[PDB]
Design a protein around this nucleic acid. Structure first.
Ligand SMILES: [Zn+2]
Lengths: 84, 49, 330, 155, 368, 54, 84, 291, 122, 144, 141
RNA sequence: AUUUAAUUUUUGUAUAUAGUUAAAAAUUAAUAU
RNA sequence: UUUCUAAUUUUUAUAUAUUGAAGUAAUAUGUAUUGAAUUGAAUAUUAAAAAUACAAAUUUAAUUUGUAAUUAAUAAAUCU
C-alpha cells in the first residue's frame, strides 16, 4: 500500500472508493464507475472548487477501532444461520 | 456456495451531542431516554402537545 | 531436448517498472519503510481517546491550555490562585513557589502595580516557610527587573551578600537584564558581567569584551513583554485544550514519546529524585547510551485497536457553567 | 555450439557478405593438417562444436580428433620419439585456413583451397616441427603463437 | 543493469552531518548555518537547543570560506558550490539539442587511415527548417521543436496539411517530426538547419521505417526451427509448434506467431558519424540500415554512451542552439573538395589483425 | 544464522552474545564468533505482507 | 595491491572530517605553508549504519556544567535559547 | 595541473587498451533506451533507482520515514537541527538525482561569521587526518582569532571546541597535582548523602585499584559545617571544585574531575604550559577489540 | 479500461485542470504582491521563483560522493531564445572533429599540495 | 551492421524501394531490354500476368503481340495490358534498330512470318520521330 | 495484449524518391571515389578486358610480422571503373597454397599494382584450370 | 554472460597466488491514434 | 414456496514491548586428594569435609591476571 503511495496518494484513495462502489454496484458496468467519477481526489487542500462552494461534511468517524485487511476473494461458506 | 449478499446495509449511528445537562445524558440503556439523542436545530419549533 | 535459443527467466507479464521494478528483492527490500511515520498511523478519533487514556485532564482556558508548542502552561492569575490555595499544603515544595513568580511575569510587566504585591507575598511567605535561598532571590529579582523597577533589582542583589548568599550565576543575569530593559546604558550591565567573570560564578570562553555581547545579543532577542522586538514581545499563544498530536516525540523514536501517562510520570519523577546507582548524574557522559533504533519495532495490541478507554476525568461542576464572556490573551 | 537463428536478421549467409559472416564449421569436418608429423591428414576429423576465425580460434581451444589417414610411411622400433600420432588420439588442433570465403574487417575476403590445421598437444604446444602451408591472419594471437612460433609466413 | 545504478543516497540521511560542504539552512531571507528559531517562543519544544552561535559549526565553516580564498588553486572545483551554472551556455548534463530529418540516399564502402572497412550509408539532409515550436501546457521537460524537410510544391500536400505551413510562414515542407529539446535549445521559427549541426565524431540515433516485407511466415518473421527435410514430417516444414502449453487454454498473450514482418518504426541507438559533405548536405554513417532508399530517417543525438555524457568537456562540445554558418561563408563558391569533413579513427587498431596487446612482436617470437 | 525454532530455545553461549530486536524478531548477536553462535527467533520476514505470509 | 576496490570510498562529510589543506615539505608562496605532510585515513567508524541519529553538541566549555540561566521559562545561555 | 584522463600514449604504454564508445559488440550501457518515455537528459543514470521509468513524477506526497517528504512539520530532535524544514525531499528510492524546475532562480547569499570583526586577521592552525586523535591540535579551533581568545585568563589561542566523551573508571593523575577532599564530621547523615558520596570518593581514590598516587590525596576534617568539598589543583594552580549535586556518588565525581581534567589540561596547554606524557589512555585510541 | 487505466482516463484531465488552476492563481498572487510589501513567507518568497539549494553535495552512508543535480529553467530566458537569432557558431567547434574514444579518468593530486579530498584509498 | 541487416536473399514486397545494399545477388532494377521473358513484380521485370507456366505465359505473350501488330488494337485484359504496352515499346525498339539480328529476335517471337514482315516497314516510317511510349493504354469501362 | 508492428504515420510512410532528382547521386559517388584516388588509396581503372588477367604484387601492410607480398594473377575486375567497388579477386598461389582472395581496391593497407600486356585469354585459362584442379582436390577425401 | 582467450595488477596473502575493469569472442538494434 | 406485506441469525470482533543491571576489589586450608606428561574452582571422576561466603564457566600448555557479582522496571486496567 505504501509502494502504491509513492506513485499517487490519490490512487490509494481511489482504490478504496472503487471497493465501496463495487460493494453493491458491480452488476452492470455503467453503475460500477459513474459514481467513481463523482468524487474529486486532492492530495492537498488547494482545489479549484471554491467556485462550487463545497459545503463541509459534518461527519465524525464511527468506528474508533482499527481496520482489518480482508482479502478481496475471501469466501465465507457458512453463516451463523439459525437453521443449524 | 451462495451469492454474496449485495444488499444495502444501514449505516452506523452519528455521535450524540455533548452532555452539558448533568441529567446522565450519557446513559444508553435507561428507561427515561429514548435511544436517539437528536436535538438538532429548529427542533424547538416542533413543540408537541 | 536441450539448448533453448532463449536463455534466462525474464518473466512474461510483470513488466511495468513502476509496480514491479526489475530490482532483486534482496536489493529492493532495503527501501520498504519499516519505520514509516508521515502517512501517520493514528486517526483523529484516538487523539482524544489516548488523551484520557493517560489520565490527563481538559481544563478550561483560564486554568491552563496546551499552547502553540503543545506544551501545557498555566495562565497567570490562575497561577497565583493556586499559590493562594496550596501555599499551606505539605506537598508544595521549594521550587513550586518560585515557579509561581515566573508565571507572574507576563502580567507583572503588563500590570506592574497590581501584581507586584503578589510577587512580594510569594516572596514574604516563602521566607517564612523556607529560610532564605537563591530560587526566591533570583526569581523576585527577575520579577523586579520586568517590573522595570531596576532600583528593586539593586535593592535585592545587595541582600544576597547581606545574607551571605553569593550572587548566583543567574543573579548577574537577572541584574544584567534589569540594567538593560530599564533604559540604562551599558557599563551598568557590563560592570555587572565583569563582576561575574572574576568571581567565576559565570564563565566566559572568549575575550571578555565579546562574550558580554553574545550575552546581550541574547538579552535583546528576549525583548520585554510590552516592547515589540523579540520572542517575549510576542503575545500570540496557541489556544488548544489538548495537543493536536498526542503521540508527538521529543527524542528520536516513538518510545521517546512526549506525553507520558500520569502513572508513569510519577515513577519517573521518583527515580530522578532518588539515588542513581545505575546512571551517573550531573555529567556529560550519560552512561545510558541512547539507542532508540535497536529497540523494539512492531505494532503491538495497542497500535491497531487504539488506546484503551478510561473514562474522562471530568467534574460534575456545580459552578453553573455560565459562559458569560470571552476571555483571551491574558 | 555457437548458433544463429534464421530470422532475416540473424542469418549466417554464406560468407561473401561482411564480417561475422557465417558457417562456423560444425562438429566433424575432416580437416587437412599441415604439420610435419605422422598426420597424413587426408583426414583429421574435428570434434569441437565450432570452428572459425571470426569465431576466433583465439578463445575456444577446439578439441579435434584424428580420423587418421595416419601416415605416408614409417618404421622402426615398437616405441619411438613421439611425434607419430596414434590412429585415434584427440588433439587441440589449430585451424589455419578455410575453403570458405572468410571476410575480414578490411573487406579482403580470402578463400583457400583446403581447410587445414596443425595438430597441437593438450597444452597447445604444437606437436609438429615445420608447417607446409600458409595461415590466415587469425593466428598471431598470443594464444597460440607463443607456441606457434611462426612456423612460417601468413596471408 | 548493475554498474548502471548510480550512487544510492537515502533521503532520510541527507542532513547536516552528511553534506560534503557546509550545510546551509535558509531562513527565507538569508542562508545561515543554524536552524531557524521560530519567533513564537511557545512554538519551541522543550529540551531542543535552539542554536544561535555554535562554535563547532561556525569554526568548521570559517575554515571553508577562508581557505577557498587563501589557496584558490586547490579548491577550484569547489566553486560550483556558490557559483552555479547559469541558464543557457549548454549545460553539460542538461541541454538536449533537436535532430534533423534525413533521407537515405545510397551506400558506399569507406576505410580509415587504417584498413577498417565501413559500409557507409550516406544520408541526404534536403531542407531542414524549424516549422513550429511546441510544448505541453508550458510544462517543464515537455518542450518539443518540430523540424520540416524537403521543400515541396504546395500541391503535393493535402490542402489541410499545407495550410499549416502556409500559416507558420515556412515554405511548405514535405515532412516534419518533433524533437524534444530543453528550453535553452530553442531557435526561431524559420531557422534553416544545416548538416554541420552534427559533428563528425558524434554518435547519432536514427529512426526510420524499416523496409516492408509483406506478410511473412514464422520461420522468417522470427527464427523458428522445424521440419526435417526428408525424414517424415507430413505437412510441417514451417508451421509453428505447440502454441499454448496444454491446459492454459488461452494462447498466452505474446506468442511469437506469423506476422506482418517489419514495416515498423525502427531505431539504431548509437551509430557514430563518419563524414559530412556540408556542400551537398550529406552525412555518412558507417552502417547499413534496412530501409528503402528515400526513407525519411530522423537523427537525434545519442545521449549518454557507456555512463558518460556525449557532449562533455574532453570529448567535443556542440554548436549549442545549432550551427549557424558565418555571413562571409556560402556554399555556392566552394566545391566538394572543401565541403568534406571526416571523423577521428573510430576503431583503435586495424581490425583484421588483433590489438597490439594480442599480436606479439618478434621479441617474444624469439622465445628461446 | 540458525533459526532457533521457538523463541524460548535462545541461549547466550558467549559473554558477548546478547539479545537484539532485529525488526520485531528477538535474536542473539555476538561480535565474537560473529555467525558461529548467532541465533534468530522464528518469525515472519522483516517485510512481509498480508497475502504472502499471512 | 590490497582490496582492488581502489578509490571505493573517496568521501568524507564536511562534518566528521577535520580540515582541508596538507603539504609534504614545500611551501607555495604564502611565507607560511608549514601544514602537515598529512595522512589519508578511513572515516569515522562505520559511518551512520551504527548511529543514524546524533544529538546536538555544544562547545566543550559550554557543554560541561551547562549553567541554568533563565528568563521567563526560557533558558538563555551566552549562545543557546530553549524553553525549559 | 595534470590531465584528468590518460592519453593514448599513456594508456598504450602500460599494455592496456582504449575503451570503445563505438560500434563494439558490448552492451554500451544505455538503459533508458526504450523505457524512459519522454525527454531524457544527458545525465547518465538519473532514473534507474526509481525503477528505470519516468512514470509518475507529479505527486508531492511520498511515504516518508523520519526526515523525508512531509515529515518537515514534525519535531524530531535530530532532523529538527539537521535538516532545514524546506529542503526535505521525496521518499527513499524516489530520490532526486536530478530535479528540474521552472522559474527565476534566487541564489541567496552565503552567511558570514558571527562575533568576528571584519578584516581581523586570524592566525591559522592547520589540522588534518594525519594527527592521531591524541593530538591536542585536533580537538580545537582551526581558525584562531584575537576575538575568541580569553585574556582575563592567560591564553595564546582560543580554547578547544570538541572534547572526547568517554567513561572514566579510576581517578588517575591526568594532570592534577593535589586532590584534597574536605569534610566536616560535625555534619552527620545516615544513608546516601553528600557526606557519603565524597568520602567513598576518598576510598575510591585511595583504592588499590585506581592508579591515583595515594600520597597525593589529602583528607581534611573541617569544623564549621562545611559541606563536603572536593578540590583538585592542576599544574597551573587553578583549583576546581566539582559541584556536588544531590544524588551524586563516586563514579560521578571520578567522572566529573577526570572529564574536566581534559578541559583543564587543555587550558593549561593554551596558556603555554608545556604538558607531560600521560600513561593511562581512558579514551581507547590505540586499542581494537579482539577475540 | 482497467482499474488503473480508468483512474487516469478520469483524473488525467483532472490534474491538468488542477495545475492550470494554480498557475492561473499564481498570476493572481503575482498581482497583489506588486503593490504589497517586499515578500512574505507565502510558500517561499512569492514571486514565481525558485530558491537555490547550496545543499546538493552529499557523502552517502557508504562513503561515496553523491551530487544532486538541480536545474532551474528561466521562463524569460527561453522566450528570449524563440525570438532572437542565435550567434554564428565558432569555427573552432565545427571545423574540429569530436573525439571518438572517451578515455578513462586518471587520478591526480592537484599540485605539490596533497589536499585532494577523497580521504584516501591507497 | 557490417553484414547487410537482411542477409543475401529476402523478398521485400510489391511496392518496395530498391534499398541498395552490398550483396552478391544480382538485381536489374531496370528493364530497357527488348522482348524479354522477365515477368515479375520487381523493378527490372515487366508485370507477370497470370498463366499456367512461364512457358504458357510466353505463349500468351506471342499471340497477344502478333495480334496487336496484325491489327493495331487489342482489347487486352488486366495485368496483360501493362505487360503488353512494354512489349509494344519493345517491338518498335526492335523494328527501329533494323539489323538482321533484331528482325530475327522478333522472328523467333512471332507465331507468323507476315507480321515480322510488317512490323519492320510501317513502324520505322510511323515512329521515326517518337522515341518512347508507343502504346496507349486506355481503359474500357465495363469490367468483363 | 497486442502490438502495432507497423507504423504508417505520414512521416514514416512518405518517401523522398520523388524529389531525389535534386541530388546528383553518382556525380557524388564520382567525387566520393575521387577523394580516395587522391589520398593514394586507389589508382584509376578503365578496363573491361586487358584486366581479366594481369600480375598484381599485393602488399597487404598487415602489421602481422611485415607486409605480405603475393605474386598474383587477377581474374575478376569487379567494377570496370574507378568507383568504390574495385574487386580484383587475384589468385595469388602463395607458395604451395591457392587462395582466391579479392581486394576491395579502396583499402589503404591493401595496395597492389597490376601490369597489362599479359591480359591473355590464355594465361587466364592457365590459372583457372590451376585453381579448378586445386579446388577439386582439396576436400580432404 | 553460462563452450574464454590475451592483456594489465600475478603483487596481496603462501607453497601457490587472488579482486573493478578493458579488448576480442557468442553479431545485432524496434514508437498504435 | 398462491400474490401483496410484516421479521429476531450481522462475508465489523481486540495482535505482547519498559531494561546491550556489565563501576564500587591484593592476598590467606588449597596449587585439595586421586587419575593423570601436565590441570592450580572451568582435562578426566569425584563430590554433601571445611572456616573468616562466592568449585556446575570463559581464559591459559599450566596459573596469575581478566570478564561476572542471586533486582525496581506491574501490557493485567475488557473494550464498547
Ligand atoms: Zn558466542
Amino acid at each position: 500500500l505504501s509502494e502504491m503511495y509513492e506513485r499517487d496518494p490519490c490512487m490509494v484513495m481511489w482504490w478504496y472508493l472503487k471497493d465501496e462502489v463495487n460493494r453493491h454496484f458491480v452488476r452492470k458496468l455503467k453503475t460500477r464507475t459513474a459514481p467513481l467519477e463523482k468524487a474529486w481526489l486532492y492530495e492537498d487542500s488547494v482545489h479549484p472548487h471554491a467556485e462550487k462552494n463545497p459545503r463541509p461534511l459534518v461527519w465524525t468517524d464511527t468506528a474508533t477501532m482499527g481496520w482489518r485487511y480482508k482479502d478481496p476473494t475471501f469466501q465465507r461458506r457458512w453463516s451463523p444461520n439459525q437453521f443449524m | 456456495s451462495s451469492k454474496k449478499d449485495r444488499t444495502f446495509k444501514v449505516m452506523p449511528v452519528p455521535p450524540p451531542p455533548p452532555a452539558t445537562t448533568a441529567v446522565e445524558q450519557r446513559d444508553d440503556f435507561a428507561d427515561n431516554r429514548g435511544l436517539s439523542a437528536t436535538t438538532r436545530t429548529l427542533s424547538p419549533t416542533f413543540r408537541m402537545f | 531436448k536441450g539448448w533453448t535459443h532463449n536463455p534466462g527467466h525474464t518473466r512474461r507479464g510483470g513488466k511495468n517498472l513502476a509496480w514491479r521494478p526489475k530490482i532483486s528483492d534482496a536489493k529492493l527490500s532495503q527501501f520498504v519503510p519499516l519505520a514509516l511515520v508521515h502517512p501517520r498511523r493514528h486517526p483523529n478519533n484516538w487523539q482524544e481517546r489516548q488523551f484520557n487514556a493517560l489520565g490527563y485532564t481538559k481544563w478550561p482556558k483560564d486554568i491552563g491550555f496546551y499552547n502553540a508548542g503543545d506544551n501545557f502552561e498555566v495562565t497567570p492569575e490562575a497561577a497565583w490562585r493556586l499559590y493562594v490555595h496550596a501555599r499551606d499544603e505539605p506537598y508544595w515544595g521549594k521550587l513550586h513557589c518560585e515557579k509561581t513568580i515566573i508565571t507572574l511575569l507576563p502580567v507583572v510587566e503588563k500590570a506592574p502595580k497590581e501584581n507586584m504585591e503578589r510577587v512580594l507575598d510569594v516572596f514574604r511567605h516563602y521566607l517564612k516557610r523556607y529560610g532564605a535561598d537563591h530560587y526566591i532571590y533570583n526569581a523576585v529579582m527577575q520579577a523586579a527587573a520586568f517590573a522595570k523597577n531596576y532600583e528593586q533589582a539593586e535593592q535585592l542583589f545587595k541582600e544576597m551578600e547581606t545574607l551571605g548568599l553569593e550572587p548566583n550565576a543567574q543573579s548577574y543575569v537577572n541584574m544584567m537584564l534589569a540594567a538593560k530593559l530599564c533604559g540604562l546604558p551599558p557599563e551598568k550591565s557590563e560592570a555587572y558581567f565583569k563582576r561575574a567573570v572574576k568571581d567565576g560564578a559565570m564563565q566566559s570562553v572568549m575575550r571578555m569584551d565579546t562574550e558580554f555581547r553574545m550575552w546581550m545579543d541574547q538579552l535583546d532577542r528576549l525583548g520585554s513583554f510590552t516592547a515589540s522586538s523579540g520572542y517575549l514581545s510576542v503575545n500570540e499563544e496557541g489556544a488548544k485544550p489538548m495537543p493536536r498530536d498526542m503521540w508527538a516525540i521529543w527524542g528520536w523514536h516513538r518510545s521517546e514519546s512526549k506525553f507520558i501517562s500520569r502513572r508513569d510520570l510519577i515513577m519517573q519523577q521518583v527515580r530522578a529524585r532518588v539515588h542513581s546507582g545505575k546512571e551517573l548524574v550531573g555529567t556529560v557522559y550519560t552512561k545510558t547510551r541512547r539507542q532508540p533504533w535497536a529497540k523494539f519495532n512492531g505494532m503491538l495490541r495497542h497500535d491497531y485497536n487504539g488506546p484503551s478507554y478510561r473514562a474522562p476525568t471530568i467534574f460534575p461542576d456545580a459552578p453553573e457553567y455560565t459562559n458569560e464572556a470571552g476571555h483571551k490573551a491574558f | 555450439i555457437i548458433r544463429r537463428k534464421g530470422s532475416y536478421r540473424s542469418r549466417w549467409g554464406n560468407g561473401t557478405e561482411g564480417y561475422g559472416a557465417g558457417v562456423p564449421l560444425s562438429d566433424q569436418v575432416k580437416l587437412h593438417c599441415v604439420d610435419n608429423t605422422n598426420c597424413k591428414h587426408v583426414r583429421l576429423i574435428a570434434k569441437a562444436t565450432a570452428e572459425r576465425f571470426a569465431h576466433c580460434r583465439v578463445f575456444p581451444a577446439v578439441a579435434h580428433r584424428v580420423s587418421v589417414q595416419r601416415f605416408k610411411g614409417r618404421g622402426g622400433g615398437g616405441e619411438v620419439s613421439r611425434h607419430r600420432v596414434k590412429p585415434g588420439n584427440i588433439y587441440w588442433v589449430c585451424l589455419f585456413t578455410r575453403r570458405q570465403t572468410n571476410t575480414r574487417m578490411s573487406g579482403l575476403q580470402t578463400n583457400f583451397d583446403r581447410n587445414t590445421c596443425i595438430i597441437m598437444n593438450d597444452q597447445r604446444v604444437p606437436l609438429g616441427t615445420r608447417v607446409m602451408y600458409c595461415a590466415g591472419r587469425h593466428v598471431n594471437h598470443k594464444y597460440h603463437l607463443k607456441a606457434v612460433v611462426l612456423a612460417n609466413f601468413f596471408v | 543493469w548493475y554498474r548502471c545504478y548510480p550512487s544510492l543516497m537515502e533521503e532520510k540521511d541527507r542532513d547536516m552531518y552528511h553534506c560534503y560542504y557546509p550545510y546551509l539552512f535558509d531562513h527565507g531571507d538569508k542562508m545561515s548555518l543554524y536552524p531557524k528559531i521560530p519567533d513564537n517562543p511557545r512554538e519551541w519544544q522543550v529540551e531542543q537547543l535552539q542554536t544561535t552561535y555554535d562554535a563547532i559549526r561556525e569554526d568548521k565553516y570559517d575554515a571553508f570560506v577562508r581557505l577557498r580564498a587563501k589557496f584558490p588553486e586547490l579548491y577550484q572545483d569547489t566553486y560550483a558550490w556558490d557559483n552555479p551554472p547559469p541558464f543557457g551556455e549548454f549545460n553539460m548534463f542538461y541541454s538536449v539539442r533537436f535532430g534533423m530529418i534525413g533521407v537515405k540516399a545510397f551506400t558506399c564502402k569507406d576505410y580509415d587511415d587504417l584498413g577498417n572497412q565501413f559500409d557507409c550509408t550516406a544520408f541526404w539532409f534536403p531542407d531542414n527548417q524549424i516549422v513550429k515550436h511546441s510544448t505541453r501546457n508550458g510544462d517543464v521537460g515537455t518542450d518539443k521543436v518540430y523540424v520540416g524537410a524537403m521543400n515541396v510544391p504546395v500541391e503535393f500536400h493535402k490542402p489541410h496539411v499545407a495550410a499549416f505551413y502556409k500559416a507558420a510562414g515556412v515554405p511548405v515542407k514535405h515532412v516534419s517530426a518533433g524533437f524534444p529539446v530543453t528550453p535553452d535549445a530553442y531557435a526561431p521559427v524559420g531557422t534553416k538547419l544545416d548538416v554541420r549541426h552534427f559533428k563528425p565524431g558524434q554518435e547519432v540515433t536514427i529512426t526510420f521505417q524499416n523496409t516492408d516485407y509483406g506478410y511473412q511466415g514464422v520461420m522468417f518473421r522470427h527464427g523458428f526451427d522445424g521440419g526435417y527435410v526428408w525424414l517424415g514430417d507430413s505437412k510441417w516444414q514451417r508451421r509453428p509448434g505447440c502454441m499454448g502449453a496444454e491446459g492454459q487454454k488461452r494462447i498466452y498473450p505474446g506468442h511469437r506467431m506469423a506476422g506482418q514482418t517489419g514495416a515498423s518504426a525502427e531505431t539504431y541507438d548509437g551509430v557514430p558519424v563518419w563524414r559530412i559533405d556540408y556542400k551537398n548536405s550529406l552525412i555518412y554513417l558507417p552502417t547499413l540500415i534496412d530501409a528503402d532508399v528515400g526513407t525519411y530517417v530522423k537523427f537525434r543525438d545519442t545521449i549518454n554512451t557507456k555512463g558518460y555524457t556525449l557532449w562533455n568537456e574532453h570529448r567535443g562540445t556542440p554548436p549549442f542552439p545549432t550551427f549557424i554558418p558565418s555571413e562571409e561563408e556560402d556554399l555556392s563558391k566552394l566545391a566538394t573538395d572543401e565541403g568534406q569533413l571526416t571523423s577521428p579513427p573510430l576503431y583503435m587498431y586495424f581490425r583484421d589483425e588483433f590489438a597490439a596487446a594480442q599480436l606479439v612482436t618478434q621479441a617474444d617470437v624469439e622465445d628461446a | 544464522h540458525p533459526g532457533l525454532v521457538p523463541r524460548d530455545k535462545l541461549k547466550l553461549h558467549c559473554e558477548f552474545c546478547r539479545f537484539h530486536w532485529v525488526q520485531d524478531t528477538l535474536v542473539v548477536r555476538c561480535a565474537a564468533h560473529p555467525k558461529e553462535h548467532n541465533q534468530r527467533e522464528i518469525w515472519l520476514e522483516p517485510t512481509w505482507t498480508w497475502g504472502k505470509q499471512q | 595491491v590490497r582490496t582492488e576496490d581502489f578509490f571505493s570510498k573517496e568521501a568524507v562529510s564536511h562534518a566528521r572530517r577535520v580540515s582541508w589543506a596538507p603539504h609534504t615539505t614545500e611551501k607555495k608562496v604564502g611565507a607560511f605553508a608549514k601544514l602537515s605532510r598529512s595522512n589519508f585515513n578511513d572515516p569515522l567508524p562505520v559511518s551512520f549504519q551504527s548511529e543514524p541519529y546524533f544529538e546536538e553538541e555544544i562547545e566543550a566549555y559550554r557543554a560541561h556544567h551547562r549553567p541554568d540561566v533563565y528568563v521567563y521559562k526560557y533558558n538563555v545561555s551566552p549562545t543557546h535559547l530553549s524553553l525549559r | 595541473a595534470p590531465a584528468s584522463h590518460y592519453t593514448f600514449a599513456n594508456l598504450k604504454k602500460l599494455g592496456l587498451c582504449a575503451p570503445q564508445v563505438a560500434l563494439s559488440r558490448q552492451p554500451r550501457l544505455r538503459p533508458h533506451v526504450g523505457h524512459l518515455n519522454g525527454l531524457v537528459y544527458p545525465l547518465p543514470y538519473y532514473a534507474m533507482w526509481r525503477g528505470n521509468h519516468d512514470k509518475y513524477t507529479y505527486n508531492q506526497a511520498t511515504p516518508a520515514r523520519w526526515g523525508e517528504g512531509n515529515t518537515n512539520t514534525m519535531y524530531h530532535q535530530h532532523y529538527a537541527h539537521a535538516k532545514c524544514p524546506t529542503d526535505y525531499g521525496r521518499g527513499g528510492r524516489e530520490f532526486q538525482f536530478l530535479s528540474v524546475k521552472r522559474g527565476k532562480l534566487k541564489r541567496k547569499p552565503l552567511p558570514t561569521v558571527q562575533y568576528v570583526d571584519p578584516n581581523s586577521k586570524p592566525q591559522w592552525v592547520f589540522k588534518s587526518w594525519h594527527n592521531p586523535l591524541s593530538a591536542p591540535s585536533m580537538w580545537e579551533r582551526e581558525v584562531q582569532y584575537p576575538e575568541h581568545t580569553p585574556a582575563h585568563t592567560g591564553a595564546k589561542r582560543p580554547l578547544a571546541v570538541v572534547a572526547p566523551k568517554t567513561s572514566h573508571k579510576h581517578l588517575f593523575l591526568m594532570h592534577m597535582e593535589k586532590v584534597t577532599v574536605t569534610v566536616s564530621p560535625l555534619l552527620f547523615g545516615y544513608g546516601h548523602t553528600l557526606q557519603k558520596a565524597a568520602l567513598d570518593f576518598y576510598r575510591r581514590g585511595l583504592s588499590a585499584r585506581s592508579p591515583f598516587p595515594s600520597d597525593k590525596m589529602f583528607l581534611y576534617y573541617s569544623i564549621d559545617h562545611i559541606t563536603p568539598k572536593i578540590e583538585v589543583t592542576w599544574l597551573d594552580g587553578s583549583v576546581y571544585v566539582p559541584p556536588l549535586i544531590e544524588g551524586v556518588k563516586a563514579q560521578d565525581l571520578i567522572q566529573m574531575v577526570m572529564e574536566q581534567a581534559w578541559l583543564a589540561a587543555d587550558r593549561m596547554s593554551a596558556e603555554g604550559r608545556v604538558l607531560n606524557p600521560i600513561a593511562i589512555d581512558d579514551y581507547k585510541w590505540e586499542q581494537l577489540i579482539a577475540f | 479500461d482497467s482499474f488503473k487505466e480508468h483512474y487516469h482516463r478520469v483524473h488525467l484531465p483532472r490534474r491538468l485542470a488542477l495545475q492550470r488552476y494554480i498557475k492561473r492563481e499564481e498570476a493572481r498572487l503575482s498581482r497583489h504582491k506588486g503593490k504589497a510589501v517586499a515578500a512574505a513567507a507565502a510558500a517561499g518568497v512569492q514571486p514565481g521563483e525558485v530558491a537555490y539549494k547550496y545543499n546538493r553535495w552529499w557523502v552517502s552512508n557508504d562513503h561515496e560522493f553523491v551530487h544532486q543535480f538541480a536545474f532551474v529553467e528561466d521562463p524569460d530566458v527561453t522566450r528570449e531564445k524563440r525570438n532572437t537569432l542565435p550567434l554564428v557558431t565558432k569555427e573552432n567547434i565545427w571545423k574540429e572533429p569530436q573525439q571518438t574514444f572517451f578515455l578513462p579518468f586518471a587520478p591526480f593530486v592537484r599540485v605539490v599540495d596533497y589536499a585532494k579530498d577523497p580521504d584516501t584509498k591507497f | 551492421g557490417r553484414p547487410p541487416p537482411v542477409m543475401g536473399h529476402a523478398k521485400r514486397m510489391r511496392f518496395a524501394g530498391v534499398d541498395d545494399n552490398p550483396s552478391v545477388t544480382h538485381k536489374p532494377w531496370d528493364t530497357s531490354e527488348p522482348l524479354m521473358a522477365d515477368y515479375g513484380w520487381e523493378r527490372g521485370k515487366l508485370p507477370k500476368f497470370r498463366a499456367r507456366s512461364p512457358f504458357h505465359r510466353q505463349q500468351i505473350a506471342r499471340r497477344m503481340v502478333t495480334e496487336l501488330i496484325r491489327k493495331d488494337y487489342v482489347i487486352v485484359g488486366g495485368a496483360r495490358a501493362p505487360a503488353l504496352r512494354i512489349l509494344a515499346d519493345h517491338v518498335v525498339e526492335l523494328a527501329k534498330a533494323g539489323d538482321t539480328d533484331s528482325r530475327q529476335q522478333l522472328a523467333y517471337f512471332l507465331h507468323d512470318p507476315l507480321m515480322v514482315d510488317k512490323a519492320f516497314d510501317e513502324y520505322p516510317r510511323r515512329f521515326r520521330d517518337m522515341n518512347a511510349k508507343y502504346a496507349m493504354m486506355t481503359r474500357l469501362k465495363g469490367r468483363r | 495484449g497486442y502490438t502495432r508492428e507497423r507504423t504508417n504515420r505520414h512521416f514514416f510512410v512518405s518517401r523522398a524518391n520523388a524529389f531525389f532528382s535534386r541530388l546528383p547521386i553518382s556525380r557524388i559517388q564520382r567525387a566520393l571515389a575521387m577523394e580516395a584516388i587522391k589520398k593514394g588509396s586507389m589508382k584509376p581503372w578503365k578496363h573491361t578486358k586487358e584486366q581479366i588477367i594481369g600480375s598484381p604484387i599485393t602488399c597487404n601492410f598487415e602489421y602481422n610480422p611485415r607486409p605480405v607480398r603475393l605474386i598474383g594473377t587477377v581474374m575478376d575486375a569487379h567494377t570496370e571503373e574507378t568507383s568504390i567497388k574495385g574487386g580484383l579477386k587475384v589468385y595469388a598461389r602463395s607458395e604451395e597454397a591457392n587462395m582466391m582472395l579479392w581486394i576491395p581496391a579502396g583499402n589503404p593497407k591493401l595496395k597492389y599494382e597490376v601490369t597489362a600486356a599479359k591480359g591473355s585469354f590464355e594465361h587466364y585459362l592457365d590459372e583457372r584450370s590451376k585453381w579448378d584442379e586445386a579446388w577439386l582436390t582439396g576436400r580432404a577425401r
